[PDB]
């Protein structure tokens, strides 16, 4: 019922998320930052039934930063994606969920940007752009409509703005704020929170 989105460009990935945490008719928090800094160049988008989301994200962050610490260098984004997929697939039996829908986004020095998709059944698939949650239905069409394999950063930002204002126009849920960050060779850049 939440909303994620990622867009892959020539040398950057722009991702965005909602900041609403609700358990009932009422939302309890309007600043929920649900994006986990995997490393200096990798972000993890986590959504699903809450409680397990935070724990699985912390486990992955733990062990990835552990890898980087034990090994000098840092994991390639493909490695992180496959690692998370394996964890989720293997654990799909015993602890009956982790029930988390993921979007792993990252950019490395020489293999370029990347963006990986995960449902709670742990199905990994690279894609130029994707989304999650009920809102994704109203959005993937727009992403198809105004996306090209090459897109300037500002054009990607305004496309995202178009998508989010469409969400507010048409979706039934209330999403008055939207975190957004961008990944390139210069680490990870916070961006202007999209508010109304």
């Amino acid at each position: 019922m939440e909303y994620l989105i990622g867009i892959q460009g020539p040398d950057y990935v722009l991702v965005a998320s909602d900041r609403v945490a609700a358990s009932n008719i009422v939302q309890m928090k309007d600043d929920h930052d649900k994006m986990f800094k995997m490393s200096e160049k990798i972000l993890l988008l986590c959504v699903g039934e809450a409680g397990d989301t935070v724990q699985f994200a912390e486990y992955i962050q733990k062990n990835v930063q552990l890898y980087k610490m034990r090994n000098g260098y840092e994991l390639s984004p493909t490695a992180a994606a496959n690692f998370t997929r394996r964890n989720l697939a293997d654990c799909l039996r015993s602890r009956t969920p982790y029930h988390v829908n993921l979007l792993l986004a990252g950019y490395d020095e020489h293999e370029g940007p990347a963006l990986y998709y995960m449902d709670y059944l742990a199905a990994l698939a690279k894609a130029p752009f994707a989304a999650h949650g009920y809102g994704a239905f109203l959005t993937l069409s727009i992403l198809d409509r105004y996306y090209t394999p090459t897109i300037s950063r500002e054009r990607a930002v305004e496309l995202l703005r178009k998508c989010l204002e469409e969400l507010q126009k048409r979706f039934i849920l209330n999403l008055p704020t939207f975190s957004v960050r961008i990944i390139d060779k210069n680490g990870i850049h916070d961006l202007d929170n999209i508010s109304f």
Partner: protein, 208 residues
């Protein structure tokens, strides 16, 4: 399936810019995982005054809208003048209000340009009857709503409206696994709807 699922709804479309209403829909009966047909026209020529729409259930939509056609021609005879869009929506809603909770799965939109001008109403199985400027129903209705909301403009020129309808229907069927087939465009101009064309998504992909 013991013979009764008939649909679950695939990617309708309708809006009412200042040169009448245009409607659009695809053609892909989804018998569970297997396509029943690629050439199921979903726009229904109720009369040269008013257009229906098939969605949610094939047989129920077709039957009840044909019955509506009977009823409205009876009306036009008795009153000697054409029935209004709102009245037709009322008739359909009252007809379908009974048999509530018996498995009906209608998702029609009544479209026409009556004396009040453009007429567009959403009539469904469970009794919703609402007018509006923008509509689409079916599985791909969400994608349709996306593209439509980003294309719509009451002052949009006619040909660009055609382009909007084609783009919306194409994107929706491109994402949906359950919507497909050839796109149909019907323009309800001044008195008497006019068929636009029936183009194919495969060719559209080349055009796009």
């Amino acid at each position: 399936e013991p013979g009764i699922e008939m649909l679950h709804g695939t990617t309708t479309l309708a809006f009412k810019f200042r040169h009448g209403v245009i409607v659009a829909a695809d053609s892909r009966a989804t018998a569970g995982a297997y396509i029943a047909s690629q050439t199921v026209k979903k726009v229904i020529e109720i009369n040269p005054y008013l257009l229906g729409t098939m969605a949610g259930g094939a047989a129920d939509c077709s039957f009840w809208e044909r019955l509506l056609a009977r009823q409205c021609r009876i009306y036009e005879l008795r009153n000697k003048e054409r029935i209004s869009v709102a009245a037709a929506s009322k008739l359909l809603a009252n007809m379908v209000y009974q048999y509530k909770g018996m498995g009906l799965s209608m998702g029609t939109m009544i479209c026409g340009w009556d004396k009040r001008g453009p007429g567009l109403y959403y009539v469904d199985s469970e009794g919703n009857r609402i007018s509006g400027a923008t509509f689409s129903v079916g599985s791909g209705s969400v994608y349709a709503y996306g593209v439509m909301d980003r294309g719509y403009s009451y002052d949009l020129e006619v040909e660009q409206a055609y382009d909007l309808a084609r783009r919306a229907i194409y994107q929706a069927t491109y994402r949906d696994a359950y919507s497909g087939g050839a796109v149909n465009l019907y323009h309800v101009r001044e008195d008497g709807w006019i068929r636009v064309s029936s183009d194919n998504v495969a060719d559209l992909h080349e055009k796009y």
